[PDB]
Design a protein around this ligand. Structure first.
Ligand SMILES: CCCCCCCC(=O)OC[C@H](COP(=O)(O)O[C@@H]1[C@H](O)[C@H](O)[C@@H](OP(=O)(O)O)[C@H](OP(=O)(O)O)[C@H]1O)OC(=O)CCCCCCC
Ligand SMILES: CCCCCCCC(=O)OC[C@H](COP(=O)(O)O[C@@H]1[C@H](O)[C@H](O)[C@@H](OP(=O)(O)O)[C@H](OP(=O)(O)O)[C@H]1O)OC(=O)CCCCCCC
Ligand SMILES: CCCCCCCCCCCC(=O)OC[C@H](COP(=O)(O)OCC[N+](C)(C)C)OC(=O)CCCCCCCCCCC
Ligand SMILES: CCCCCCCCCCCC(=O)OC[C@H](COP(=O)(O)OCC[N+](C)(C)C)OC(=O)CCCCCCCCCCC
Ligand SMILES: *[C@@H]1O[C@H](CO)[C@@H](O)[C@H](O)[C@H]1NC(C)=O
Ligand SMILES: *[C@@H]1O[C@H](CO)[C@@H](O)[C@H](O)[C@H]1NC(C)=O
Lengths: 450, 456
């Protein structure tokens, strides 16, 4: 019936970010976790959340802040020479213990402390992170394969290209730009009125898969030029079988895990809990769902799969069946390796840039930043223009920009693990320091929770 | 002040001039190139500023003239003829037509051109621009294919004699970047950002800014080859071995046949039709300006420079005011003439940037086209049509049939252009004038014809 038709849209909207994030994770973590592990985690946790989750509307999947934390912890472990996949196991153990502690007491008291200020700053930071990662990957591609006059005839291609290649960088840039352009034009077409309504909504729903298909075909019919493709195992296998297996031994894989890190892995668990709580506040709003999500993440850390987040009677059962089918098909997607291996990473990074740009649409901070470059009489009819003065609004925006810059600097420094703590430090900034400068009347308008 | 006011119209008359000169050099095998077009534009600009009745009309080369030059070049290369020498007799017949117009006025032919023919002509020119841009891109990709292995011992003295590693992809990137930067600057012009003065200032110079950005982007890329614009050293012919300055009638290399010297009146009629119709689009007293332009073109054909047409150009887009316009036109024409001395700047401009500007002009010429609007309405549902008179008073399928007949006319014109008998393209265009006047009243009633084909 229509259930199988509704399954397809959820499947594609849950698969394209899944494969994109799997590629990004494989690049950042030296392929220690890749597309296969993320797909297996998404499938298993989706099945469990569909069978026994409180709110079926929540889809459990990987996200940007989790990727940033994984990159930061990988950098920390490679700086201190630690077993990263084994440290994640103790992170999961401490997350489970924190889940038990939250269950014992009441965790709904801290929900109301998060306001629009922190959420908007967090989303803007995530969008900037996406854009920066896309452009950094483009710069690395152009650095690895420079535009030279003469290239070597026969370079080794078994692990990867060992030298510069003629058309790799320019074609990668073309593929990224074309993917982004087609996705944006399909989004713009979705809100237009150029075809019949059913066709318009259908094509706009599948804009990302259509753009991906177009650009993969474009690179497919180009024969002799090399582009970096997605690394997918043929079966239900670990990406890097040389580094890790399936069950990660908590007492070290190669060398013995130190006791000091075994006891100090509670602080990274606190950071993970803060990140998941903030993204749930952004999306979900529920302590049962948080219970389930963090518990499944802690359990999956033991088997090497990553933790995820809650990104967003008969009808409830229909949602149960829909979620179960989407999770099962996401799990079976790893068996479709001949298709996934032909997808260039340039298309995936174009989709990454598209997501980063389109996450800025509903951001009031982004609109208020755009108001910096307009004359004062072009401001829209929003309550934070007529009720507050222009320079007060600009000062509010400047303080938010200063907070964003401090967060970016903290991310850049080697102490990038403490980014969730610095991010959550903005809550007492709004509750304590902002009332000193601004007035209450200005603050309710600039920080309205509607 | 005038010294700052002339700069905008200078750039808006120079960028299409260099683009058309490069493209004419490509299609014409450098019989006429950037040097000839620039010299013709300067001389005719001076002579039209000093003697023109209406100074607001700028004199310059355009798309229909380029299509006519292509068609005549193909006709001359098909037969045994010198292409540069037939243009001399075309100019002679044009001067004779100018002499024969002052006797019996042609003001009665002005009323016969309506919105139908003008809109069809503009749409055809836009499609021609887009097709030429994409054909050049396809030829670039064919000359330098994406291969696994390239031979790096290739001679580059006349041109690259073999495929190059990454020329085609960089050319495509440059074309796309130029087009997108020009479109984004146009969109910024009609926006609400920045102080208003600056918005109009940067929006006015969107094309020069996009050209500068992309030329710099290509300039800082060192080891990659891109095809650059061919500009001579100074006041020199583009191809010195071909024609020279004073091209000799009655044959340069071989004997020019008498039958062609007598039958060159038909191409003169076709080019006069093209110039007259483009001047009609420009307008929407005038006899003096039109005949002066045609006479200057006929005289310039004697020295090898191309003929030009008239276009409406304003400053934003009594005796003192007309005198200031005189001085402005003279200064702009003199500076366009002096622009040929900037070889180190003009030779570093890639042709990909100019073709991006060509695509930009082709796309942006479609903005005020009512035929384009009704083509866009072919896809919208009937409830989304705007409140224009040709929708409220005209049934939906009636105007769809009107647009379909116009599309059929456009397809016939395209087939004629692709046909080797492409010289007769303007005449077929004139066939759209009786079609509105004779056959359309048989199908549509008078009310729907007045609504769809509105005078203004
Ligand atoms: C070559 C093209 C020839 C076309 C000639 C024939 C063109 C022609 O006659 O239009 C009919 C059709 C739509 O007609 P039509 O209005 O009856 O279709 C829908 C109908 O009106 C619904 O009631 C509307 O919902 P609502 O009650 O308002 O809520 C809906 O609006 P939306 O809300 O869904 O937008 C409408 O789409 O449009 C095309 O086929 C585009 C073809 C492009 C392919
Ligand atoms: C870049 C180097 C120069 C920087 C100098 C920067 C100097 C600077 O700070 O200007 C700020 C200016 C303030 O606008 P502001 O209203 O004071 O200035 C204009 C004035 O109000 C006019 O009266 C308006 O015309 P009108 O009476 O309504 O008809 C005109 O609007 P428009 O009608 O013309 O649209 C206004 O632009 O605009 C920005 O905020 C953009 C800042 C982004 C920076
Ligand atoms: C969505 C559109 C985004 C466009 C952004 C382009 C990113 C380019 C990154 C260059 C990194 C770098 O500097 O690379 C350095 C390498 C050499 O490497 P090396 O000498 O070993 O160091 O230079 C090269 O061979 C390439 C020279 C730079 C080419 C830039 C092309 C820009 C096209 C712009 C189209 C709008
Ligand atoms: C808005 C700016 C323009 C955007 C459109 C670009 C059109 C490119 C035309 C390519 C076809 C062609 O030219 O293919 C012809 C060539 C030559 O083939 P050969 O075997 O040597 O032929 C010998 C006779 O094929 C190729 O080597 C394949 C080149 C494929 C390039 C694909 C680029 C995709 C760009 C997508 C941008 C969103
Ligand atoms: C797998 O892990 C080993 C050890 O960390 C590493 O050397 C290798 O590069 C990894 N594989 C890939 C494909 O990166
Ligand atoms: C100049 O003309 C000759 C003969 O027509 C032609 O072979 C040559 O290619 C032309 N020069 C250029 C630069 O095209």
């Amino acid at each position: 019936p229509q259930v199988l038709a509704a399954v397809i849209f959820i499947y594609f909207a849950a698969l394209s970010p899944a494969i994109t994030f799997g590629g990004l994770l494989g690049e950042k973590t030296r392929n220690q976790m890749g597309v296969s592990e993320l797909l297996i985690s998404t499938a298993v946790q989706g099945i469990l959340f569909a069978l026994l989750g409180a709110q079926p509307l929540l889809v459990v999947g990987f996200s940007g802040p989790l990727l940033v934390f994984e990159e930061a912890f990988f950098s920390f472990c490679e700086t201190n020479g630690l077993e990263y996949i084994v440290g994640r196991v103790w992170i999961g153990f401490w997350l489970i213990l924190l889940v038990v502690l939250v269950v014992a007491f009441e965790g709904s008291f801290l929900v109301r402390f998060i306001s629009r200020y922190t959420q908007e700053i967090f989303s803007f930071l995530i969008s900037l992170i996406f854009i920066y990662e896309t452009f950094s990957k483009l710069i690395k591609i152009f650095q690895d394969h420079p535009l030279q006059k003469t290239y070597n005839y026969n370079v080794l291609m078994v692990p990867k290209p060992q030298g510069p290649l003629p058309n790799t960088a320019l074609l990668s840039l073309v593929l990224m730009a074309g993917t982004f352009f087609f996705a944006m034009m399909l989004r713009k077409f979705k809100n237009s009125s150029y075809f019949p309504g059913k066709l318009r909504r259908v094509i706009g729903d599948f804009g990302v898969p259509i753009s991906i298909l177009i650009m993969v075909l474009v690179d497919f019919f180009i024969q002799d030029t090399y582009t970096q493709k997605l690394s997918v195992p043929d079966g239900f296998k670990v990406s890097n079988s040389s580094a890790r297996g399936w069950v990660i031994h908590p007492l070290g894989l190669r060398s013995e895990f130190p006791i000091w890190m075994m006891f100090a892995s509670a602080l990274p668990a606190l950071l993970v809990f803060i990140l998941i709580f903030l993204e749930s506040q952004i999306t979900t709003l529920f302590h049962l769902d948080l219970l389930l999500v963090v518990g499944m993440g802690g359990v999956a850390a033991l088997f090497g799969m990553p933790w995820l987040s809650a990104t967003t009677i008969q009808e409830v059962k229909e949602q149960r069946i829909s979620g179960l089918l989407v999770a099962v098909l996401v799990g079976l997607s790893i068996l479709m390796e001949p298709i996934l291996s032909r997808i260039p990473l340039a298309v995936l990074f174009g989709i990454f840039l598209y997501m980063g740009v389109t996450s800025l649409s509903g951001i009031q901070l982004f609109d208020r930043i755009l108001l910096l470059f307009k004359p004062p009489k072009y401001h829209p009819d929003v309550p934070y223009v007529k009720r507050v003065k222009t320079w007060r609004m600009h000062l509010f925006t400047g303080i938010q920009i200063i907070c964003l810059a401090v967060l970016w600097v903290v991310k850049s420094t080697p102490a990038s693990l403490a980014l969730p703590f610095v991010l959550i430090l903005t809550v007492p900034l709004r509750r304590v320091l902002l009332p000193l400068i601004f007035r209450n009347v200005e603050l309710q308008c600039l920080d309205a929770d509607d």
